[PDB]
Amino acid sequence: CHWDLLVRHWVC
């Protein structure tokens, strides 16, 4: 679970 600031969500 890393924060993808591009879309603005947690990508696990």
d(CA 9, CA 2): 8
d(CA 3, CA 6): 9
Element (H, E) at 9: strand 9-11
Q: Is the dihedral of CA 8, 3, 11, 5 positive or negative?
A: positive
Q: How far is CA 1 from CA 4, 5, in A?
A: 9, 12
Experimental method: NMR
Q: Do residues 9 and 2 make contact, with C-beta atoms less than 8 angstroms apart?
A: no
Q: Do residues 12 and 4 make contact, with C-beta atoms less than 8 angstroms apart?
A: no
Q: Do residues 1 and 9 make contact, with C-beta atoms less than 8 angstroms apart?
A: no
Side-chain-side CA neighbours of residue 10 (13 Å): 2
Q: Which two tokens stand for residue 4?
A: 């993808």
Q: Is the dihedral of CA 8, 6, 4, 10 positive or negative?
A: positive
